[PDB]
Design a protein around this motif. Structure first.
Motif, PDB file in Angstrom:
ATOM      1  N   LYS A  76       0.845  -1.184   0.000  1.00 41.47           N
ATOM      2  CA  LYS A  76       0.000   0.000   0.000  1.00 41.47           C
ATOM      3  C   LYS A  76       0.883   1.237   0.000  1.00 41.47           C
ATOM      4  CE  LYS A  76      -3.816  -2.318   2.289  1.00 41.47           C
ATOM      5  NZ  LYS A  76      -4.532  -2.527   3.570  1.00 41.47           N
ATOM      6  N   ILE A  77       0.665   2.109  -0.977  1.00 43.20           N
ATOM      7  CA  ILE A  77       1.487   3.290  -1.196  1.00 43.20           C
ATOM      8  C   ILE A  77       0.659   4.505  -0.807  1.00 43.20           C
ATOM      9  CG2 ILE A  77       2.838   4.609  -2.844  1.00 43.20           C
ATOM     10  CD1 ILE A  77       3.063   2.032  -4.501  1.00 43.20           C
ATOM     11  N   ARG A  78       1.118   5.236   0.201  1.00 43.80           N
ATOM     12  CA  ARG A  78       0.435   6.435   0.660  1.00 43.80           C
ATOM     13  C   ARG A  78       0.911   7.643  -0.134  1.00 43.80           C
ATOM     14  NH1 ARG A  78       2.341   8.861   6.268  1.00 43.80           N
ATOM     15  NH2 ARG A  78       1.347   7.010   7.177  1.00 43.80           N
ATOM     16  N   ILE A  79      -0.040   8.449  -0.597  1.00 44.54           N
ATOM     17  CA  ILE A  79       0.232   9.665  -1.352  1.00 44.54           C
ATOM     18  C   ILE A  79      -0.502  10.785  -0.626  1.00 44.54           C
ATOM     19  CG2 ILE A  79       0.196  10.800  -3.585  1.00 44.54           C
ATOM     20  CD1 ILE A  79      -0.277   7.973  -4.796  1.00 44.54           C
ATOM     21  N   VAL A  80       0.234  11.597   0.120  1.00 45.65           N
ATOM     22  CA  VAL A  80      -0.333  12.718   0.859  1.00 45.65           C
ATOM     23  C   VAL A  80       0.123  14.011   0.206  1.00 45.65           C
ATOM     24  CG1 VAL A  80      -0.149  14.021   3.000  1.00 45.65           C
ATOM     25  CG2 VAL A  80      -0.705  11.595   3.068  1.00 45.65           C
ATOM     26  N   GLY A  81      -0.821  14.905  -0.059  1.00 49.30           N
ATOM     27  CA  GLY A  81      -0.463  16.162  -0.669  1.00 49.30           C
ATOM     28  C   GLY A  81      -1.535  17.205  -0.459  1.00 49.30           C
ATOM     29  N   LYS A  82      -1.440  18.272  -1.246  1.00 50.40           N
ATOM     30  CA  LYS A  82      -2.359  19.397  -1.154  1.00 50.40           C
ATOM     31  C   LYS A  82      -2.956  19.702  -2.518  1.00 50.40           C
ATOM     32  CE  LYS A  82      -1.276  22.151   2.914  1.00 50.40           C
ATOM     33  NZ  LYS A  82      -0.812  20.981   3.706  1.00 50.40           N
ATOM     34  N   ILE A  83      -4.215  20.115  -2.513  1.00 53.93           N
ATOM     35  CA  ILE A  83      -4.903  20.621  -3.691  1.00 53.93           C
ATOM     36  C   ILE A  83      -5.099  22.113  -3.472  1.00 53.93           C
ATOM     37  CG2 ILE A  83      -6.921  20.426  -5.165  1.00 53.93           C
ATOM     38  CD1 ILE A  83      -7.313  17.609  -4.088  1.00 53.93           C
ATOM     39  N   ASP A  84      -4.400  22.929  -4.254  1.00 57.44           N
ATOM     40  CA  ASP A  84      -4.470  24.378  -4.146  1.00 57.44           C
ATOM     41  C   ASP A  84      -5.521  24.887  -5.120  1.00 57.44           C
ATOM     42  OD1 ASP A  84      -2.446  24.091  -2.348  1.00 57.44           O
ATOM     43  OD2 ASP A  84      -0.886  24.993  -3.598  1.00 57.44           O
ATOM     44  N   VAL A  85      -6.504  25.616  -4.598  1.00 55.91           N
ATOM     45  CA  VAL A  85      -7.620  26.116  -5.393  1.00 55.91           C
ATOM     46  C   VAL A  85      -7.120  27.338  -6.160  1.00 55.91           C
ATOM     47  CG1 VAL A  85      -9.973  26.958  -5.363  1.00 55.91           C
ATOM     48  CG2 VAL A  85      -9.261  25.222  -3.735  1.00 55.91           C
ATOM     49  N   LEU A  86      -6.744  27.137  -7.426  1.00 56.61           N
ATOM     50  CA  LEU A  86      -6.303  28.253  -8.255  1.00 56.61           C
ATOM     51  C   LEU A  86      -7.459  29.179  -8.608  1.00 56.61           C
ATOM     52  CD1 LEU A  86      -3.793  26.482 -10.680  1.00 56.61           C
ATOM     53  CD2 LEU A  86      -3.325  27.729  -8.567  1.00 56.61           C
ATOM     54  N   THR A  87      -8.666  28.633  -8.738  1.00 62.88           N
ATOM     55  CA  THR A  87      -9.866  29.422  -8.966  1.00 62.88           C
ATOM     56  C   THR A  87     -11.011  28.758  -8.219  1.00 62.88           C
ATOM     57  OG1 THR A  87      -9.008  29.845 -11.185  1.00 62.88           O
ATOM     58  CG2 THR A  87     -11.201  30.653 -10.670  1.00 62.88           C
ATOM     59  N   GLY A  88     -11.889  29.584  -7.649  1.00 66.12           N
ATOM     60  CA  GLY A  88     -12.892  29.145  -6.694  1.00 66.12           C
ATOM     61  C   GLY A  88     -13.569  27.825  -6.996  1.00 66.12           C
ATOM     62  N   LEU A  89     -13.419  26.867  -6.088  1.00 67.76           N
ATOM     63  CA  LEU A  89     -13.896  25.504  -6.276  1.00 67.76           C
ATOM     64  C   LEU A  89     -15.291  25.374  -5.683  1.00 67.76           C
ATOM     65  CD1 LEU A  89     -13.341  22.576  -7.165  1.00 67.76           C
ATOM     66  CD2 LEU A  89     -12.403  22.184  -4.893  1.00 67.76           C
ATOM     67  N   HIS A  90     -16.238  24.916  -6.497  1.00 69.24           N
ATOM     68  CA  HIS A  90     -17.626  24.738  -6.083  1.00 69.24           C
ATOM     69  C   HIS A  90     -18.037  23.294  -6.357  1.00 69.24           C
ATOM     70  CE1 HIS A  90     -21.889  24.793  -5.801  1.00 69.24           C
ATOM     71  NE2 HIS A  90     -22.100  24.908  -7.100  1.00 69.24           N
ATOM     72  N   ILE A  91     -17.781  22.416  -5.385  1.00 75.13           N
ATOM     73  CA  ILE A  91     -18.242  21.037  -5.518  1.00 75.13           C
ATOM     74  C   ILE A  91     -19.761  20.972  -5.410  1.00 75.13           C
ATOM     75  CG2 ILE A  91     -18.114  18.730  -4.566  1.00 75.13           C
ATOM     76  CD1 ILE A  91     -15.592  19.443  -5.930  1.00 75.13           C
ATOM     77  N   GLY A  92     -20.327  21.614  -4.395  1.00 79.33           N
ATOM     78  CA  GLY A  92     -21.774  21.619  -4.262  1.00 79.33           C
ATOM     79  C   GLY A  92     -22.293  20.260  -3.839  1.00 79.33           C
ATOM     80  N   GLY A  93     -23.608  20.160  -3.686  1.00 79.23           N
ATOM     81  CA  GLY A  93     -24.233  18.921  -3.264  1.00 79.23           C
ATOM     82  C   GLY A  93     -24.866  19.002  -1.889  1.00 79.23           C
TER      83      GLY A  93
END
Ligand SMILES: Nc1ncnc2c1ncn2[C@@H]1O[C@H](COP(=O)(O)OP(=O)(O)NP(=O)(O)O)[C@@H](O)[C@H]1O
Ligand SMILES: [Mg+2]
Lengths: 296, 721, 200
Positions: free
Chosen positions: C3-20
């Motif tokens: 099992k390979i762990r991949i930990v990182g960050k997602i930087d919102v370059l422009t406003g993120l609207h997942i919604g729901g």
């Protein structure tokens, strides 16, 4: 060798009931044991230790202060507060068994449970959209545990079985538990250690015996155990989760097991029940009984 | 036989009261002797000699049913003719709320005014009884249910005792029904004991009458269905609404069938059924060995049936406790303790709900079952191509018919399974007659039909108000016709209401001195008739479809404004009918038309649960932040704030929704500075000075700013295009 | 099994609207943690977007797509190698937003000019504020060692596309531009070596 294993869930968990939309706070012992068996299959660990020497307990809430146990099914002399009450802290367990807990105290205990918040995430499938279709909405229930709260379970087994359980739980931390794992749910970190409070509580002798796991007696011991028994026959069922069982997903044989907290005057040693029919491998449904004695 | 005559006499023993008020036994004997079928010796002797003084001088055969009727009347009971019927809620919660003076005028509400039933009204009832008995009603084993229905339809609001010293909560119908039940139980008990001479051990020694009071001859039997709320909501959305309207009704009708089966096994009428609530049925049975054997066999058969059909999804547990005449008469204060023992035995039955063989058969599955139904999620039963189980398909097919037709038929062939190898279906009058003719001993339940005259028909109250069904086009539209609004935001309001502390009201609402089977039965009947018939009367012109209405739970989906308005009206009518005393708490949610029914039901249930939390008698409107009292929502919001805002916005030719939204933003900003900006906006608004000051004062204070926000949101919802 | 762990960050370059919801308020609120109320990126959204982008790149019925993102087809039952957990609003970004007193989510007002009446219909969509970083945790499962290099190349392609293609939301209108930062890649379970493996 009794080992308390606490699980702190980084991500919300499904732990779904019969509906995908439905979300449950905890999971029974059969679900956790199936997860352990899947992990052992992946890790290529021998299943004899789990199937024979391992006795686990239903995952139960725990807060910053106390660990919770299922409400024993005993005669009580405001019954609605007791009926809505589901989990009792370890210290209050003996008091509840003796009957000192009243309706106001029962409501206060039920409010004291700060396990987490249950929500219903709404998702869609866009697979059909590419194929000249339409998005399909669905709902995944989830239970976001409060930061100090989590799910604990007691595992009793031999030292080799305890070590194999430690390895399996270390792998299951990243494998995850519950439903919709590998889709953003079920990730957790587990800490396993000896619990003095539970080692003292389990080392009790009482007139009544309380199930700490979803269990079911064998046909030979059911006649002895079922007398004067207050229980809740919970329906355990579902589909088989494996790649080699069949070419397609097949439901497990319907099973009915005594729920956690059920009180039996005569103990029974549970059995690993095979709920697989016409499959390439066997599907183990954990019904081994973890008992807690108490005086009422 | 003799039991039939005894039941007819006991149900009609106090028919003389009506003709006398237009004695209770001397004139009733003549009135019944007027009609040839009721002129039977067993009936007229029962009516004439049900009083102790007349029984003393009675020239009987020492084995006549008159002694049984007399002792049954004594147990049931234990002088202004114009005195009205006092409402049960006069004594309900009298220790906390108080002892009111609400009385029924000649479904009806207590009015609290001083009213006296005129002798003209009693004479009108007398000629109604004469017309029904002489021509319509008849004496027969299958016609006694018609007699009971006729008594329920007529004497429901006639005081049992004209004596104004004692309370007049118990009606003549309730007293007669309880007397008939007690007489049937005592007759069965004496037959089991081979009591050939009734007079010897019933009347002739008064001390022996007291001993018979102390003798344990009755059985309080409670049968409760478990898994009801789970079963109703154990559905998928695909036809959830239909199933939601059907399953509850199903679990109603099936339950009724249950008790009827029991009453068929003990050869007792519906009079012995003390009262049926939501999934509960309390009955008074004889203490005969045959009665206990019948109870055990019925329990085993019904457990087997429910395990066969619903497995563990549904169950029925029936527990009985033996009691004496003293217990029914509340002497020594054991009546409440008797019901406590019955419910304790019921809970013990619930704990050990299944036996060894049943559990083994549960775990001894043969095959996986491959495909499974969507709703029940069960693979043991055969599943159709539409992925619907046979029971699930039957429920879905029932939904529309039960919504449209009125005659439920427990026929050998039908739509949905029912206990004794029969199926429930829903047809019209002609269909019910055909089902009766083709298969004998087929039960017919008439929905909301108090009319008597059909021998093989039992009345069954059920709220089926659905505004969409009034027009065929709106019926085809379904709930989508509710959002067909030319003005106002197209939305569906979902109302879910539950009575607060109704269980405690039945347990300890009635004081000890007023505790009786008759009064509790009257209270149960009134609550059921309110939530089945009067609930339909309240919702008359509203665009509302009542999905279900149980004993206390109510779930209805309609137009949002109509749902809120009728929730307020229902609260007002509940206060009027309960005369204070009982209250109920509800949750109201607003959703889009295409929002899933399951989601709306779940969210509205969460709102209702939050409204119940803390202070009861609260409605959780829309968001969770808007939990308000009923008077707060009806008057402090709509009347106090919403209506003046509507008046100002409609009258002002230089204002519109933009001003309302600016007000809403200022009120919801909550930065402690927006009060001044709101004052500035109102100053430039050129609105009413009084309204401007009122709005500013409401904004400046909490518990009133939220009400003003609610009023503005309601107004802007109302004035949508 | 590895099992390979991949930990990182997602930087919102422009406003993120997942919604729901409430009148005159955000009608499309982003998904939030029900307790902490912090906006989150569902693991389902990341997994689906990566699957769709990788499907477009490969072209889903492709064996690589099925093996990576799970398959339940008749005769083809494959556990998803990529277990992409929900990305949570990072504590560092939470502190950065608490400083300067900035809301974690912005209410973006938009409208709709119609072609018939030219009238505008307004909407208020909630978007995760630009500059927010989400801590994303992914677990890769080594079912076959020989396929690890190909699977990680596919993951690299999917991550590149997701850095160029928006995340969940109306990204064609700008809502959802993101950038991936791979903090670490470790093998939590097993003896496999992930030093050579790079998501970016
Ligand atoms: N047919 C029905 N439709 C709607 N509500 C109902 C119906 N029958 C009962 N209820 C209500 O449901 C509640 C209790 O239902 P039920 O699920 O049977 O609980 P229960 O009697 O305690 N059985 P269990 O919950 O398994 O112990 C009460 O508020 C009833 O008024
Ligand atoms: Mg209730």
């Amino acid at each position: 060798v009794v080992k308390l294993v606490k699980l702190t869930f980084k991500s919300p968990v499904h732990f779904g009931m019969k509906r995908l939309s439905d979300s449950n706070h905890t999971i029974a012992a059969d679900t956790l044991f199936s997860a352990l068996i899947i992990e052992a299959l992946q890790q290529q660990l021998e299943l004899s230790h789990l199937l024979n020497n391992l006795v686990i307990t239903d995952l139960f809430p725990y807060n910053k202060t106390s660990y919770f146990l299922p409400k024993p099914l005993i005669r009580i002399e405001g019954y609605k507060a007791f009926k809505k009450l589901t989990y009792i802290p370890v210290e209050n367990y003996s008091e509840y068994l003796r009957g000192e807990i009243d309706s106001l105290e029962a409501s206060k205990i039920a409010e004291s449970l700060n396990l987490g918040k249950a929500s219903l995430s709404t998702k869609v499938s866009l697979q059909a959209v590419d194929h000249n279709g339409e998005s399909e909405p669905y709902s995944v229930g989830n239970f976001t545990f409060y930061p100090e709260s989590g799910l604990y379970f007691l595992a009793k087994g031999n030292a080799d079985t305890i070590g194999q359980l430690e390895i399996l739980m270390h792998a299951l931390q990243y494998s995850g538990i519950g439903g919709k794992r590998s889709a953003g749910y079920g990730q957790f970190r587990c800490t396993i250690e000896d619990s003095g409070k539970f080692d003292s509580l389990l080392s009790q002798t009482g007139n009544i015996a309380i199930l700490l796991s979803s269990a079911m007696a064998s046909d030979e011991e059911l006649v002895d155990c079922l007398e004067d028994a207050r229980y809740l026959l919970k329906k355990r069922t579902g589909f088989v989760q494996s790649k080699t069982y069949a070419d397609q997903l097949v439901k497990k044989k319907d099973f009915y097991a005594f729920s956690a907290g059920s009180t039996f005057y005569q103990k029974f040693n549970g059995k690993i029940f095979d709920v697989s029919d016409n499959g390439r491998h066997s599907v183990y449904r954990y019904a081994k009984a973890f008992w807690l004695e108490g005086k009422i | 036989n003799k039991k039939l005559e005894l039941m007819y006499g006991s149900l009609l023993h106090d028919i003389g009261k009506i003709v006398y008020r237009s004695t209770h036994s001397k004139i009733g004997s003549q009135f019944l002797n007027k009609f040839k079928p009721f002129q039977l010796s067993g009936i007229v002797d029962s009516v004439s000699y049900h009083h102790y003084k007349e029984l003393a001088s009675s020239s009987l055969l020492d084995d006549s049913v008159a002694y049984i009727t007399y002792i049954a009347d004594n147990i049931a009971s234990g002088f202004d003719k114009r005195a009205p019927l006092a409402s049960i809620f006069n004594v309900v919660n009298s220790e906390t709320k108080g002892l009111a003076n609400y009385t029924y005028s000649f479904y009806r509400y207590p009015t609290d005014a001083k009213k006296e039933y005129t002798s003209s009204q009693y004479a009108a009832l007398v000629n109604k009884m004469t017309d029904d008995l002489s021509n319509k009603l008849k004496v027969g084993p299958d016609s006694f249910s018609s007699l009971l229905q006729w008594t329920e339809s007529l004497w429901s609001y006639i005081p049992s005792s004209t004596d104004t010293n004692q309370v007049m909560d118990v009606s003549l119908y309730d007293h007669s029904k309880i007397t008939c039940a007690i007489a049937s139980c005592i007759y069965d008990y004496l037959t089991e004991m081979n009591c050939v001479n009734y007079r010897k051990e019933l009347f002739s020694p008064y001390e022996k009458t007291k001993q018979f009071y102390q003798e344990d001859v009755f059985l309080l039997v409670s049968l409760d269905m478990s898994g009801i709320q789970d079963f109703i909501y154990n559905i998928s959305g695909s036809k959830a609404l239909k199933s939601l309207r059907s399953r509850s009704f199903y679990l109603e009708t099936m339950l009724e069938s249950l008790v009827d089966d029991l009453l068929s096994d003990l050869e007792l009428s519906r009079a012995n059924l003390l009262y049926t609530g939501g999934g509960h049925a309390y009955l008074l049975l004889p203490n005969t060995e045959r009665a206990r054997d019948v109870l055990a066999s019925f329990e085993g058969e019904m457990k087997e049936w429910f395990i066969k059909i619903f497995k563990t999804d549904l169950s029925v547990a029936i527990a009985y406790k033996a009691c004496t005449g003293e217990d029914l008469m509340n002497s020594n204060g054991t009546y409440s303790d008797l019901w406590q023992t019955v419910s304790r035995k019921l809970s013990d039955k619930k704990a050990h709900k299944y036996s060894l063989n049943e559990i083994k058969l549960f775990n001894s599955t043969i095959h996986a079952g491959t495909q499974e139904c969507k709703e029940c999620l069960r693979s043991d039963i055969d599943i159709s191509e539409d992925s619907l189980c046979k029971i699930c398909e039957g429920i879905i097919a029932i939904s529309n018919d039960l919504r449209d037709y009125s005659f439920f038929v427990v026929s050998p062939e039908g739509k949905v399974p029912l206990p004794r190898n029969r199926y429930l279906s829903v047809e019209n009058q002609d269909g019910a007659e055909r089902k009766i003719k083709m298969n004998k001993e087929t039960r017919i339940y008439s929905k909301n039909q108090p009319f008597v005259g059909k021998q093989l028909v039992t009345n069954l109250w059920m709220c089926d108000y659905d505004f969409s069904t009034l027009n065929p086009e709106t019926k085809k539209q379904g709930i989508a016709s509710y959002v067909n609004r030319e003005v106002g935001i197209p939305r569906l309001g979902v109302l879910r209401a539950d009575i607060d502390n109704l269980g405690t009201t039945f347990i300890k609402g009635i004081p000890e001195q007023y505790r009786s089977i008759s009064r509790t039965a009257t209270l149960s009947r009134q609550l059921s008739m309110f939530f089945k018939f009067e609930l339909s009367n309240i919702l008359k012109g509203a665009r509302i479809s009542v999905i279900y209405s149980g004993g206390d739970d109510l779930f209805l989906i309609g137009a949002w404004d109509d749902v809120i308005s009728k929730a307020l009206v229902l609260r007002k009518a509940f206060t009027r009918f309960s005369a204070g005393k009982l209250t109920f708490s509800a949750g109201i949610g607003m959703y889009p038309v295409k929002y899933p029914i399951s989601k709306m039901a779940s969210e509205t249930g969460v709102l209702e649960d939050l409204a119940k939390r803390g202070e009861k008698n609260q409605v959780a409107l829309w968001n969770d932040s808007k939990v308000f009292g009923w008077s707060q929502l009806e008057e402090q919001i709509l009347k106090e704030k919403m209506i003046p805002l509507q008046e100002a916005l409609t009258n002002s030719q230089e204002h519109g929704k933009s001003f309302l939204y600016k007000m809403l933003e200022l009120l919801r900003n909550e930065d402690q500075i927006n009060i001044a900006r709101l004052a500035y906006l109102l100053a430039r608004s050129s609105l009413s000075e009084e309204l401007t000051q009122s709005i500013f004062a409401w904004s400046q204070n909490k518990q009133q700013k939220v009400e003003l926000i609610t009023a503005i949101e309601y107004l802007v919802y109302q004035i949508r295009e | 099994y590895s099992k390979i762990r991949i930990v990182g960050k997602i930087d919102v370059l422009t406003g993120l609207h997942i919604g729901g919801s409430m009148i005159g308020a955000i009608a499309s609120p982003v998904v939030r943690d029900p307790y902490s109320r912090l906006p989150i990126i569902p693991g389902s959204s990341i997994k689906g977007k990566m699957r769709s982008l990788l499907a477009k790149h490969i072209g889903q019925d492709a064996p690589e797509i099925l093996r990576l993102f799970g398959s339940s087809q008749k005769g083809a039952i494959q556990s998803s190698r990529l277990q992409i957990s929900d990305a949570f609003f990072s504590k560092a970004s939470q502190e950065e937003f608490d400083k300067k007193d900035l809301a974690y989510t912005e209410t973006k007002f938009e409208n709709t000019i119609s072609r018939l009446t030219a009238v505008a219909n307004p909407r208020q969509i909630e978007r995760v504020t630009r500059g927010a970083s989400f801590d994303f945790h992914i677990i890769y499962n080594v079912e076959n060692i020989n396929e690890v290099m190909a699977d990680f190349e596919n993951i690299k392609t999917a991550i590149h596309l997701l850095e160029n293609d928006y995340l969940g939301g109306g990204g064609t209108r700008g809502n959802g531009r993101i950038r991936f930062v791979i903090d670490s890649i470790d093998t939590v379970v097993g003896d496999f070596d992930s030093s050579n493996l790079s998501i970016k």
